[PDB]
Amino acid sequence: GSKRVIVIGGALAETAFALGGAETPRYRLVGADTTCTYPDAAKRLPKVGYQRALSAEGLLSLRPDLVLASAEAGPPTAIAQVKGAGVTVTTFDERHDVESVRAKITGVAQALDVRDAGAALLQRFDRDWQAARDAVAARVPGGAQPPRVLFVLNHTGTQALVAGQRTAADAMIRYAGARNAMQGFDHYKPLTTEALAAAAPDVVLISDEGLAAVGGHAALLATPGFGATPAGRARRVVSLDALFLLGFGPRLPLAVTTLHRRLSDALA
Numbered sequence: 607g608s609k610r611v612i613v614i615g616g617a618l619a620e621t622a623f624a625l626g627g628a629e630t631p632r633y634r635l636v637g638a639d640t641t642c643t644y645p646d647a648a649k650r651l652p653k654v655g656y657q658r659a660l661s662a663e664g665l666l667s668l669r670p671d672l673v674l675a676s677a678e679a680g681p682p683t684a685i686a687q688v689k690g691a692g693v694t695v696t697t698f699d700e701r702h703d704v705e706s707v708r709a710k711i712t713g714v715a716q717a718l719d720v721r722d723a724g725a726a727l728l729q730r731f732d733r734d735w736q737a738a739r740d741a742v743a744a745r746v747p748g749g750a751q752p753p754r755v756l757f758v759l760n761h762t763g764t765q766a767l768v769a770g771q772r773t774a775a776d777a778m779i780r781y782a783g784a785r786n787a788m789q790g791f792d793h794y795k796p797l798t799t800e801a802l803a804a805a806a807p808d809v810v811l812i813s814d815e816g817l818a819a820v821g822g823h824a825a826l827l828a829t830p831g832f833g834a835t836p837a838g839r840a841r842r843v844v845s846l847d848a849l850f851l852l853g854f855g856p857r858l859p860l861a862v863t864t865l866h867r868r869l870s871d872a873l874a
């Protein structure tokens with residue numbers, strides 16, 4: 607018999623699909639949460655709510671034999687309800703680093719009973735990651751000092767919503783050879799003109815999505831304080847798909863390489 611599997615969390619879903627895809631003789635992926643938009647086969651799974659607002663009744667309506675959940679999956683009441691029904695829920699942490707992605711690969715493969723496919727994916731990943739680390743170490747974007755990057759997850763605002771430390775953005779900026787222009791706070795906050803002028807970003811990074819919630823590139827650089835910054839003076843903007851940039855899944859080597867390439871282009 608085939609296990610019916612639900613996956614909660616975009617990076618976990620990518621990992622599950624990269625091990626084989628929607629179907630193997632051992633398991634079938636039958637549901638996910640709304641953050642699971644990659645690959646195309648994940649985007650097509652029935653969804654049972656946003657990862658932190660799970661419906662236990664919705665999740666159980668798909669009759670799962672196994673749930674693979676990011677440690678961020680919630681609320682705790684819903685996860686308790688699902689385990690209470692005799693469903694195995696196996697939880698995975700989402701630390702913003704490569705070793706957590708590597709442990710995710712082997713841990714997911716082991717939960718789906720596909721250890722040999724996990725070893726093979728991890729071998730590919732390790733190969734790509736060394737290449738990514740080589741490429742970043744070869745050259746600093748801009749070829750001089752490590753540039754200061756401001757990441758804008760959203761802009762509401764009428765200010766930027768921006769990433770401090772202990773975020774996925776901070777780690778990606780650092781893996782790509784740059785420095786976070788925002789210092790002195792953790793997680794995300796709205797941005798002041800006075801903090802932005804202190805940040806003096808050389809490049810502004812923004813979600814492919816969250817470039818709409820400003821009006822586009824030209825509108826973004828018309829935000830107060832942006833114009834006087836080194837980024838705004840040189841009009842250095844880089845947009846990227848949020849889940850690909852920030853997801854910390856099996857595309858991590860490509861995500862780091864890409865961010866590095868974009869920052870190099872921008873700082874030409």
Ligand code: HEM
Pocket residue numbers: 759769772773774775776793794795848849852
């Ligand atoms: C609609 C598509 C959305 C996407 C793809 C998205 C994506 C993300 C991502 C990738 C992160 C982690 C980034 C990092 O660690 O650097 C994050 C954090 C967060 N997101 Fe979203 N988001 C979306 C909409 C929303 C909405 C509607 C809300 C709330 C009303 C929201 C609230 C948050 C909050 C509160 C955090 C944590 C902020 C903090 O650490 O202080 N997002 N989101």
Ligand code: HEM
Pocket residue numbers: 616640641656658774849852853
């Ligand atoms: C890689 C990590 C994350 C991703 C990909 C992500 C993505 C998203 C997406 C796609 C939505 C909107 C779902 C929809 O309605 O279509 C959302 C909403 C939200 N996110 Fe997350 N997020 C992440 C991390 C976080 C974190 C760390 C927090 C809080 C600490 C957070 C808090 C919220 C909240 C409160 C909402 C509001 C729900 C809603 O308005 O529908 N997110 N996020």
